Amino acid sequence: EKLTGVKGMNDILPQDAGLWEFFEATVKSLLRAYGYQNIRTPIVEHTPLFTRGIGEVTDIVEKEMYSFVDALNGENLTLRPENTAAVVRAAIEHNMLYDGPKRLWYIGPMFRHERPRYRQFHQVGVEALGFAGPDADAEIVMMCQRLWEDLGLTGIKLEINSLGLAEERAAHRVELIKYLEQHADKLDDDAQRRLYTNPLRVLDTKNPALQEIVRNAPKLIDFLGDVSRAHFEGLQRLLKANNVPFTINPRLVRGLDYYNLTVFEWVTDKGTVAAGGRYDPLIEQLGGKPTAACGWAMGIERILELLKEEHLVPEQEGVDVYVVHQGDAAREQAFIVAERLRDTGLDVILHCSADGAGASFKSQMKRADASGAAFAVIFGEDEVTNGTASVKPLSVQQSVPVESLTEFLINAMVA
Amino acid sequence: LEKLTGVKGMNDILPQDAGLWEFFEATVKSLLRAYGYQNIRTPIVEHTPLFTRDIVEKEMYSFVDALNGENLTLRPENTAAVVRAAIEHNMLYDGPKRLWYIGPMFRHERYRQFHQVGVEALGFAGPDADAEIVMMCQRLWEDLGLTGIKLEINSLGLAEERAAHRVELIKYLEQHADQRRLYTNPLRVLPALQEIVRNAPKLIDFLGDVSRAHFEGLQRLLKANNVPFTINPRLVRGLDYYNLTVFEWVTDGTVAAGGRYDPLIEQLGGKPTAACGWAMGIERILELLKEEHLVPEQEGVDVYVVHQGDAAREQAFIVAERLRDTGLDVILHCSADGAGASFKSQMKRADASGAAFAVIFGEDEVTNGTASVKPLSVQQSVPVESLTEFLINAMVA
Ligand SMILES: N[C@@H](Cc1c[nH]c[nH+]1)C(=O)O
Ligand SMILES: N[C@@H](Cc1c[nH]c[nH+]1)C(=O)O
């Protein structure tokens, strides 16, 4: 009886690997280019980390985490839905901020029961821990822009917003509720549920009849005091100074309650591809010295789909040589020369047959073609006896003294 | 307000360890390309029955899905999941496949989260493929700089041979009243008891000629390629899918382990075939690289941009971006408190960063249209439009 992979948890197969490899190489290089350094936290953490970090009022913590209890230990555990809180957890646990702020990046799988596509998905993300900003905020937004350029993607647009501080949120909440209450007759059931608990999430509505209402809602940005406005405006100053286009979207709210001040999204118009923001309260909330922080994450799969849609999938890398052989004597030689060629820095596949028995030259040569190899290096009885290797570019097949094969191949790749 | 802790046995990997991981990952990934092996990534969880078909008994993190009720397990291992994808996606339709994987694995119980890199040669009868994958391990040690890692091999033959061996082992063990485990798990019975165990019937003497030919052919290839080895007949691995070739790489403990497992594919519902592979615990190899002092040096960025004044900070920002456009790695000074910092403090950060240069902007630099560059010679003024050529030139030495 055949088994299947958990629905919403895809395998990544050799045909897709190159595309992942391109993305990973590109972003990892960008990350180095800004001085960000890798941190890797576990796949599981204690459940309370997410409940306190992300917030009991959110769909993630309520409806969407994979949580369970450890048999032997009775520890409560959850597969990470996200990595910011875990970074905070490691920063606090390991005293990372003793000697100053830290530029951190991470990459790996995350988990979520969502309505539709991916219950296992992958993020790359950054955390700038200990920086008040708004310079740090500008930096991390810029890191995203550079990634699009480096990847070849165009038409990704930045929207920003401020959630201000707690008191300013509270004042705003009041007038928003007072406003939304005026139109309770037209609110849907999802809006009603959220009205008195997280009304900001009502502004995000997709409901057609609510659009003109939500667009005229009281804007959180109008309740920003001096410190907030200065931060938000200073972020905008830096972005302008670097010619980064953007729109202010006051309905931009994220599905994690740790955010304050800056929030931002990168969005494609045929949706969100990168998202982040500042979250100064979080470190204290998880028991740490009060500390400012901002960061972002990207859903890789969603960026990969974009690269496919826009035809930016690079060509499969092939190996340099495919070693073809018949005979016991030839196979030993094929092994030995395969190894020498690799010692030289070449990529080499040595023919091995599904069924164990030697194989026909024609079948091996078909495999050689399919492999993307540039040369077939061929050993039969004559070659073994004469001390040669027969090389065929994938021109005409050529005999070469085996002791010269390396120079021969190197030379020929000069082309 | 209470601090939260990392799950015991699940270590964080922090920046100061990352380079060591990066070195290992880069080295092995390059070796894997060099043999034509291609990445497959399976999920962290699978349906529990996959692993059922000590490890399975005590050692898996299993649980029940709250939404759908389905039974799920954090993978303890990756071979079965590779087989699961190969079957699910019809990977062997057009021929055999050379696969590698890397990622975290989980064991309920020094590491409860640990990491493996491994290979599966799916669809190859061998023993050529067996030789290849063993040889891949040897190359990795050389490339990593590790010495004194030794290969032991063994055959588990086929089921009937395994069974026949059991008989004579029990018959032999029965002759030495010197008892609970004799009838139950006699392999686990192999002090003054050494001379007895050392003369126990060896599984290798019950290999029929299909088995012997495979094992002997593996030995042939290994000898021809100058891979030394010892036959260790006490070598058994901790899962019953292994058939024929089994092998371990050991440091005088096991650092790589693998073998052939032809029955497994059919057992998971696939067209009958052959397969062999291996896996390595990364953490164990990393400890070795530390012990033998093969930890490479941390690499630093090329430039640290230092500034004071509002005008200077904007410029610092813009130039940091231009320098990165040109291929340099750059850290832009940003302060905890958001405002400026002292030249001395910034310069301390510049030093600690491993940057090769501090590029400095104050009000004079902004006005004059210059950048002040200090190697980490003396501090030198340069037209900002030339900073790139300046820095590149300076690094060529
Ligand atoms: N962790 C957030 C993004 C983020 C990173 N840093 C701050 N916010 C998410 O999963 O969307
Ligand atoms: N999966 C095995 C090793 C292996 C890979 N392929 C075959 N065996 C392990 O975890 O030890």
Author numbering:
A (entry chain A): 9 to 124, 128 to 281, 286 to 409, 419 to 439
B (entry chain B): 8 to 60, 67 to 122, 128 to 196, 203 to 214, 219 to 280, 286 to 409, 419 to 439
What does the original paper state about this entry?
Aminoacyl-tRNA synthetases (aaRSs) charge tRNAs with their cognate amino acid, an essential precursor step to loading of charged tRNAs onto the ribosome and addition of the amino acid to the growing polypeptide chain during protein synthesis. First, the aaRS combines the specific amino acid with adenosine-5′-triphosphate (ATP) to produce an activated aminoacyl-adenylate intermediate which reacts with the appropriate tRNA to produce the aminoacylated tRNA. In general, aaRSs are divided into two classes based on the global fold and sequence conservation. Crystal structures were determined for a CysRS from Borrelia burgdorferi bound to AMP, GluRS from Borrelia burgdorferi and Burkholderia thailandensis bound to glutamic acid, a TrpRS from the eukaryotic pathogen Encephalitozoon cuniculi bound to tryptophan, a HisRS from Burkholderia thailandensis bound to histidine, and a LysRS from Burkholderia thailandensis bound to lysine.
We solved a 2.65 Å resolution structure of HisRS, a class 2a aaRS, from the gram-negative bacteria B. thailandensis bound to its cognate amino acid L-histidine. B. thailandensis is commonly used as a model for B. pseudomallei because of their genetic similarity and its far less pathogenic nature. A comparison of the human and the B. thailandensis HisRS structures reveals a backbone RMSD of 1.13 Å. The sequence homology between these two proteins is 24% identical and 42% similarity of amino acids. Unfortunately, the human structure is an apo protein so we can only speculate as to the similarities of the binding pocket residue interactions for the human protein but we see homologous human residues for Tyr269, Tyr270, Thr92 and Glu90 that likely play a role in hydrogen bonding of the cognate amino acid in the human protein much like they do in the B. thailandensis HisRS structure.
